[PDB]
Design an enzyme around this catalytic site. Structure first.
Site, PDB file in Angstrom:
ATOM      1  N   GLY A 157      -4.147  -1.208   0.783  1.00  0.00           N
ATOM      2  CA  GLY A 157      -4.944  -0.653  -0.551  1.00  0.00           C
ATOM      3  C   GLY A 157      -4.982  -1.242  -1.379  1.00  0.00           C
ATOM      4  N   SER A 197      -0.222  -3.845  -7.031  1.00  0.00           N
ATOM      5  CA  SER A 197       0.894  -3.110  -6.333  1.00  0.00           C
ATOM      6  C   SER A 197       1.089  -1.901  -6.885  1.00  0.00           C
ATOM      7  CB  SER A 197       1.931  -4.006  -6.095  1.00  0.00           C
ATOM      8  OG  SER A 197       2.847  -3.459  -5.351  1.00  0.00           O
ATOM      9  N   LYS A 198       0.906  -0.805  -6.243  1.00  0.00           N
ATOM     10  CA  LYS A 198       1.007   0.528  -6.867  1.00  0.00           C
ATOM     11  C   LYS A 198       2.336   0.870  -7.338  1.00  0.00           C
ATOM     12  CE  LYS A 198       0.260   5.407  -6.032  1.00  0.00           C
ATOM     13  NZ  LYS A 198      -0.067   6.473  -4.905  1.00  0.00           N
ATOM     14  N   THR A 239       6.482  -3.435  -2.645  1.00  0.00           N
ATOM     15  CA  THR A 239       6.394  -3.868  -1.417  1.00  0.00           C
ATOM     16  C   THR A 239       6.686  -5.255  -1.085  1.00  0.00           C
ATOM     17  OG1 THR A 239       4.188  -2.411  -1.309  1.00  0.00           O
ATOM     18  CG2 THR A 239       4.382  -4.423   0.244  1.00  0.00           C
ATOM     19  N   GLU A 268       5.977  -7.844   1.069  1.00  0.00           N
ATOM     20  CA  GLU A 268       4.994  -8.775   1.186  1.00  0.00           C
ATOM     21  C   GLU A 268       4.212  -9.306  -0.115  1.00  0.00           C
ATOM     22  OE1 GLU A 268       4.035  -6.208   4.967  1.00  0.00           O
ATOM     23  OE2 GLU A 268       4.831  -6.243   2.876  1.00  0.00           O
ATOM     24  N   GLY A 277      -3.675   4.679  -2.028  1.00  0.00           N
ATOM     25  CA  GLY A 277      -3.732   3.304  -1.776  1.00  0.00           C
ATOM     26  C   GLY A 277      -4.990   2.792  -1.184  1.00  0.00           C
ATOM     27  N   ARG A 278      -5.460   3.478   0.013  1.00  0.00           N
ATOM     28  CA  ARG A 278      -6.740   3.297   0.259  1.00  0.00           C
ATOM     29  C   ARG A 278      -7.954   4.004  -0.051  1.00  0.00           C
ATOM     30  NH1 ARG A 278      -3.348   6.261   3.012  1.00  0.00           N
ATOM     31  NH2 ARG A 278      -3.696   8.224   4.057  1.00  0.00           N
ATOM     32  N   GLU A 304      -5.795   5.084   8.688  1.00  0.00           N
ATOM     33  CA  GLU A 304      -4.762   5.471   7.972  1.00  0.00           C
ATOM     34  C   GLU A 304      -4.591   6.753   7.554  1.00  0.00           C
ATOM     35  OE1 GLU A 304      -1.426   3.211   5.924  1.00  0.00           O
ATOM     36  OE2 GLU A 304      -2.153   5.003   5.984  1.00  0.00           O
ATOM     37  N   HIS A 325     -24.453 -10.216  20.685  1.00  0.00           N
ATOM     38  CA  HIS A 325     -24.187 -11.324  21.695  1.00  0.00           C
ATOM     39  C   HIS A 325     -22.503 -11.310  22.044  1.00  0.00           C
ATOM     40  CE1 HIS A 325     -28.054 -13.388  20.577  1.00  0.00           C
ATOM     41  NE2 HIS A 325     -27.844 -12.652  19.366  1.00  0.00           N
ATOM     42  N   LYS A 331       9.018  -0.570   8.672  1.00  0.00           N
ATOM     43  CA  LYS A 331       9.862  -1.268   7.405  1.00  0.00           C
ATOM     44  C   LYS A 331      11.221  -1.383   7.343  1.00  0.00           C
ATOM     45  CE  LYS A 331       5.934  -0.344   4.255  1.00  0.00           C
ATOM     46  NZ  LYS A 331       5.310   0.285   2.795  1.00  0.00           N
TER      47      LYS A 331
END
Ligand SMILES: O=C(O)[C@H](O)[C@@H](O)[C@H](O)[C@H](O)COP(=O)(O)O
Ligand SMILES: O=C(O)[C@H](O)[C@@H](O)[C@H](O)[C@H](O)COP(=O)(O)O
Lengths: 555, 555
Positions: free
Chosen positions: A158, A209-210, A214, A216, A271-272, A357, A388, A518
């Site tokens: 998010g 970052s909320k 996190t 990452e 977040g999203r 999500e 294609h 996680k």
């Protein structure tokens, strides 16, 4: 259970079981000159028109009615109101779900625990514009003393997809802004290949970052800082190159970023659904605050549209009920999103998260085990490229695949006197036509006749050149892909997602399905150190881990 | 339909539910210490190891046996041989399917109509190296005397995805080479944004097109040439900035290209299997011809493994039969591809084309109407990013989704002493573990007890924190993602796609589902001119066209 109890849901199911197999798109159109008029809705936003043609669908006026009764029967309207009024509908986390507040231009108060939210919303918006200004054109502080050329957003999920998608989509409004990059993956290759092109003294990092915990993001953030602190040896210069979007000031100052350079959002901002808040700082930095506030409005327009339009003519509601029809009655596993627009090459992916999500759940709000399908698998690729790459399976495969084709009437680049966009539009139109019409055995046979194939050859090729058609699509055309319309389009789907979630009686603003990965992850990290074999897990995990330790040394 | 009428197929199908004992990953691992050893295979290529762990699957030794008997029963081996021996197995077009020839380093003759193909294959390969060396060394100059800095490949579908995917994936081997760009979409924004960053006199264009008549490519090509000819007024300078990869000399000599500047391939080279031929010129130009041959050698390697390994231990075969199991017995619509590697961010999409356009068929080779599912919908996103975007629906949704997790043991960027890649590996391992183990109602409760939740909290939160698991995955780990391994990995899937196609008795090298869209497209192009309303189509197409003409000039 829940949904499966509802009478309107039961009636809708029995109707399908009995008349579903006869519904033919080709048939419908020849026996109803008004199908288009009866199954589409044009929306004037005063800032561009948005036509939603949902006529190439396996539905009759009776079907649309049963579908609408269902939406009403499930309390879509009351649920909508509860969301807008600030009630804590995200039950499992006991939080409010207020992304409509972040874009609430009307400033109508929204109260959460006896406190209107708008003041704190505009407080932050103002601070972003203030910071935006100081960066956009000189005046901001490079420990070296030079204006900042590049902005790097470091965040995941998010705190990443939205800003990235919107920025790619609104490039024509880049206008005097710095270059923006987006680092998210923990995979070291990601930040490394970004830092290799940057110059410390002129780079501004935005750790989005909320929770600000996190793994990452914080790891990528620490690697950026160590990289920066490599050229600039003064740890106090960090406050001139690092800013933050989060809620935990304590965490933010811990990292080294001072409190006034922390743009905040709130727990009721999923977040999203965060690009509309501070998380959209990189968007504002790229296209200016005007183009941003414009984005904020388009959603608000849609927000109000969703709120004040009777269900029979409500876009989000119609888009959602059509999906339910194909998901809970026809049993289609996926939802294809195909925007004939290069700028929107990240649009479909934005909603994989957006949709999946949210609605990838099996537990309703009462705690009952769902006994019906929920969120679809959302996928897609833009332009004519798909035609294609995989349209082959959409046309002649064995899977029914609902498709949303989107496209702007006029492009940002009418090169060659509009020839490119002309061909682009034709394909956009022709594909849904073909997906509907198809090509019968006789139409095909007749073609092979005029080809000169021998009865031997014709037969061995005939069925292969047959298109059974009857493949349902939605066509969403808009005047132009501007910040306002884009904002309108994103909000539209956000609410589609909301309506489906309410119909399935699930909590669309939950992400519990992410914690098992996680935690088992944190448990494995230290076991990877050293070369002794691991045996604490199942044979497969052990094997994988050991194969890794063995090969980690090889050359 | 030669499949549902197969005895081993019917046995497999009746077994799937002829009895309970319903497979459950957590239970199978709990009772079989030998699971990993019994359901995995490590491959030593002498240029890196490739471990294929397929133990986290809903299968028993009995299942693998029934699945293997089926592959044999449908003549997988004979079909394979017919492909390699140059027989015209692409029945509907009466063509040979020889992409294994393009990478046939052994040079074992392959005859097509009394003529070995290798000589013409190596002739072209040599010419590519000759050209490649000239542009990179700085020998090849624009009619200005300047060396060449940027290479722009203009092509679509098969003449685009492969080179793009491989080039992004092998960036660490960029080494000295030019900057390569990829223009495909007809959407004018695509070439415009590319031409805006280029300098005529230093740019080399590669018009990649098998037929050399595709509308998007030729139009983009004509726009590049007009753009170039804008700065360089001499139309004879075109031969110094334009080269072509095709099989159509006549049309190539019509565009303005020089016959000796045309690198050719052959009708037996399918577009979605063309990156190994001349179509890979931009790959060679980016990473040198050495790396390019390591790419082909890698594929050539997998080809030999596919050809000489008994079915019970044949990777492509095992990957294919597992899919059939989930596709034709469980009824899963999709195949997820998840590479924990940023460089491979275009991998999933590549095979989204390779798989879907190959097996999105409903007509078998005999002309019989398929009465069983065929090719799956293939989707996916890399790194750990997916864990934050859609894994929620994979873990707790209502759709069974087979997942292939891929990852290299060692990265191209071991920054921070390998901490990033360490976390990346842990998540890669933890996710399939979680997808398999899940978390029972009691284990979850035992957690909310520990955390100290109230009798109320734990209650309304308990179900939502439950992971039913039992979600099947394949883990594909390799020593490192080098040109050889990448080439091995791509070939592996190509053959998985081949095996499934043979089992369904369909022609995987067909693209008939494409024409309807193209022709209806050509029919609409001229109708878009002018402002008079169109009425020749169905009400929907008419409406869309007219809404377009209406909004075409609004501001
Ligand atoms: O909201 C979501 O859609 C998901 O939970 C996820 O995408 C989340 O946003 C980040 O993984 C956490 O990053 P933050 O700590 O910045 O919220
Ligand atoms: O195999 C395929 O998937 C198709 O053939 C398709 O991908 C094709 O490559 C493009 O439509 C351009 O075709 P040309 O290379 O002939 O221009």
């Amino acid at each position: 259970a829940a949904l499966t109890r509802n009478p309107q849901f039961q009636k809708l199911q029995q109707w399908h079981r009995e008349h579903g197999s006869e519904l033919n798109l080709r048939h419908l159109f020849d026996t109803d000159k008004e199908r288009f008029n009866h199954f589409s809705l044009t929306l004037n936003t005063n800032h561009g028109h948005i036509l939603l043609d949902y006529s190439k669908n396996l539905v009759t006026e009776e079907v649309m009615h049963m579908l609408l009764d269902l939406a009403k029967s499930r309390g879509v309207e009351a649920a909508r109101e509860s969301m807008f009024n600030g009630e804590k509908i995200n039950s499992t986390e006991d939080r409010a779900v207020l992304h409509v507040a972040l874009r609430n231009r009307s400033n109508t108060p929204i109260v959460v625990d006896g406190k209107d939210v708008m003041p704190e919303v505009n407080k932050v918006l103002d601070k972003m514009k203030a910071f935006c200004q100081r960066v956009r054109s000189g005046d901001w502080k490079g420990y070296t003393g030079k204006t900042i050329t590049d902005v790097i957003n470091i965040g995941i999920g998010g705190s990443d997809l939205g800003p990235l998608m919107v920025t790619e989509a609104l490039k024509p409004y880049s206008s005097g802004g710095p270059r923006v990059w987006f680092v998210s993956n923990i995979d070291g290759t990601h930040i490394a290949k970004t830092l290799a092109c940057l110059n410390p003294e002129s780079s501004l990092f935005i750790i989005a970052s909320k929770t600000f915990t996190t793994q990452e993001t914080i790891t990528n953030a620490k690697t950026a800082k160590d990289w920066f602190l490599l050229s600039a040896k003064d740890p106090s210069t960090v406050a001139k190159h690092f800013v933050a979007l989060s809620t935990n000031t304590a965490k933010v100052k811990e990292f080294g970023i001072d409190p006034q350079n922390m743009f905040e959002f709130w727990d009721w901002v999923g977040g999203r659904y965060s690009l509309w808040s501070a998380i959209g700082l990189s968007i504002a930095l790229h296209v200016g605050f005007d183009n941003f506030e414009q984005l904020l409005s388009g959603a608000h327009w849609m927000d109000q549209h969703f709120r004040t339009t009777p269900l029979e003519k409500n876009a989000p509601v119609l888009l959602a009920m059509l999906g339910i029809w194909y998901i809970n009655c026809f049993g289609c596993e996926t939802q294809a999103v195909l925007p004939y627009d290069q700028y929107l090459h990240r649009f479909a992916a934005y909603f994989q998260q957006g949709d999946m999500e949210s609605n990838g759940k099996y537990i309703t709000k009462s705690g009952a085990r769902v006994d019906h399908q929920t969120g679809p698998i959302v996928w897609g690729e833009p332009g004519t490229n798909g035609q294609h790459a995989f349209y082959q399976l959409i046309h002649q495969g064995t899977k029914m695949i609902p498709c949303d084709f989107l496209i702007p009437v006029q492009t940002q680049h009418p090169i060659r006197k509009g020839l490119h966009h002309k061909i682009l539009l034709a394909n956009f139109l022709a594909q849904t036509e073909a997906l509907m019409k198809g090509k019968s055995t006789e139409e095909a046979r007749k073609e092979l006749q005029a080809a000169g194939k021998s009865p031997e050859d014709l037969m061995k090729l005939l069925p292969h050149k047959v298109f059974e058609g009857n493949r349902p699509t939605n066509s969403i055309v808009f005047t132009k892909l501007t910040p306002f319309i884009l904002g309108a389009l994103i909000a539209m789907y956000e609410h589609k997602i909301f309506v489906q979630g309410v119909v399935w009686d699930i909590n669309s603003f939950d992400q519990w399905g992410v914690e098992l990965g996680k935690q088992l992850a944190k448990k494995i990290e230290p076991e990877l150190d050293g070369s002794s074999p691991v045996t604490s897990h199942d044979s497969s995990t052990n094997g994988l881990i050991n194969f890794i330790k063995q090969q980690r040394e090889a050359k």
